[PDB]
Amino acid sequence: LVHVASVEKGRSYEDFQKVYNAIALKLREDDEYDNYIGYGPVLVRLAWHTSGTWDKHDNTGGSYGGTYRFKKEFNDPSNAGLQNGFKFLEPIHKEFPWISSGDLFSLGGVTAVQEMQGPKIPWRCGRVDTPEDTTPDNGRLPDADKDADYVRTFFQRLNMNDREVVALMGAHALGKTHLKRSGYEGPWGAANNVFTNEFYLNLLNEDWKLEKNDANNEQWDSKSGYMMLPTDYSLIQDPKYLSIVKEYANDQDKFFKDFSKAFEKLLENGITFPKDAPSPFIFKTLEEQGL
Numbered sequence: 001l002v003h004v005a006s007v008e009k010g011r012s013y014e015d016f017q018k019v020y021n022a023i024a025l026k027l028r029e030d031d032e033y034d035n036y037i038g039y040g041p042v043l044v045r046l047a048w049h050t051s052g053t054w055d056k057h058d059n060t061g062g063s064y065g066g067t068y069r070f071k072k073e074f075n076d077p078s079n080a081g082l083q084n085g086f087k088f089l090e091p092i093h094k095e096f097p098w099i100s101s102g103d104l105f106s107l108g109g110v111t112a113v114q115e116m117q118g119p120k121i122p123w124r125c126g127r128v129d130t131p132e133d134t135t136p137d138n139g140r141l142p143d144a145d146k147d148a149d150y151v152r153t154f155f156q157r158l159n160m161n162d163r164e165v166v167a168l169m170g171a172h173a174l175g176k177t178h179l180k181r182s183g184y185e186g187p188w189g190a191a192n193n194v195f196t197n198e199f200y201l202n203l204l205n206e207d208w209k210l211e212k213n214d215a216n217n218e219q220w221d222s223k224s225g226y227m228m229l230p231t232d233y234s235l236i237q238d239p240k241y242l243s244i245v246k247e248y249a250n251d252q253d254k255f256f257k258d259f260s261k262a263f264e265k266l267l268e269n270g271i272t273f274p275k276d277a278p279s280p281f282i283f284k285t286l287e288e289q290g291l
């Protein structure tokens with residue numbers, strides 16, 4: 001199936017900047033969530049999980065149809081906790097009912113990254129809601145207890161290469177694992193609601209110990225109180241991933257640029273943009289607007 005981007009009728013960059021801004025203002029206001037981490041990280045994860053169901057082989061799943069709004073997908077065990085991001089976005093959608101669900105979930109992620117001081121992420125509109133029966137089955141999102149070979153093979157289905165995978169994984173600077181959600185517990189670093197290359201630095205520089213958490217799963221833990229999932233740790237066990245981890249640990253701008261590209265790409269798999277579609281939008285942050 002072909003999913004052609006269709007601009008919400010009559011809308012242009014200013015309309016979407018208003019949605020951006022409402023997201024960004026609520027991110028600022030609703031600051032208590034998750035022990036004052038705020039909603040940034042879970043909105044980034046929502047954007048990723050609503051995009052990451054895509055299968056390049058048949059164009060099922062992906063961000064286009066906004067199918068997370070249907071119970072099969074919102075109740076995917078892999079999506080445990082993302083209901084908080086959805087609830088955050090609900091008043092946004094009520095204010096701007098014209099935006100499609102896919103456009104709102106993906107824009108939430110863009111807005112969160114940028115408001116957290118991350119790179120600009122160009123964003124295109126035009127996702128169109130598709131019906132309940134287009135919701136992908138559970139099981140398309142990745143397991144965390146696996147090795148580098150798993151990770152690499154997993155991401156081929158999303159048409160991501162080694163650099164794109166390692167870049168995307170840098171989003172694990174953000175937020176934390178929550179035992180009751182995923183069976184893993186702990187943050188990956190100190191700056192977990194500011195977008196930086198800390199994930200790579202911690203991978204390389206902390207003294208990691210392989211421990212079992214209170215859900216009886218193995219994770220890597222440091223004396224600083226940080227953790228890595230087995231799939232995170234795989235990025236320094238595999239020599240190809242390791243090189244790239246070192247690159248991003250040593251060049252914040254490179255990480256930003258590569259993350260931006262990969263994240264836009266992730267959010268756009270599956271979508272065909274007509275030749276005369278608008279160019280991607282680059283939203284101004286609240287700070288850049290003086291808001």
Ligand code: HEM
Nearest residue numbers: 041042044045048142143144168171175176177178181182
């Ligand atoms: C091999 C791939 C990946 C695996 C196995 C994985 C797994 C996990 C797990 C287990 C959690 C913790 C969930 C919880 O307990 O709340 C998590 C959190 C998170 N992941 Fe991933 N992840 C992967 C890739 C990504 C990618 C590609 C991104 C986005 C670019 C991403 C962004 C996030 C964010 C932002 C959080 C924190 C959520 C929060 O604090 O609520 N992850 N991930």
